[PDB]
Amino acid sequence: ACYCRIPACIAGERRAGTCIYQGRLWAFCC
């Protein structure tokens, strides 16, 4: 699956987009 993450994706994951949640920008990580 993919996961909204902050501050960044786990090494090896790809930032495939972004999430907006609780007033912050998250990386959408696949």
Curated annotation (Swiss-Prot):
Residues with the Phosphotyrosine modification: Y21
Residues recorded with modification ADP-ribosylarginine: R14, R24
Disulfide bonds: C2-C30, C4-C19, C9-C29
UniProt protein name: Neutrophil defensin 1
Species of origin: Homo sapiens
Gene: DEFA1
Whole sequence portion shown: 65 to 94 of 94
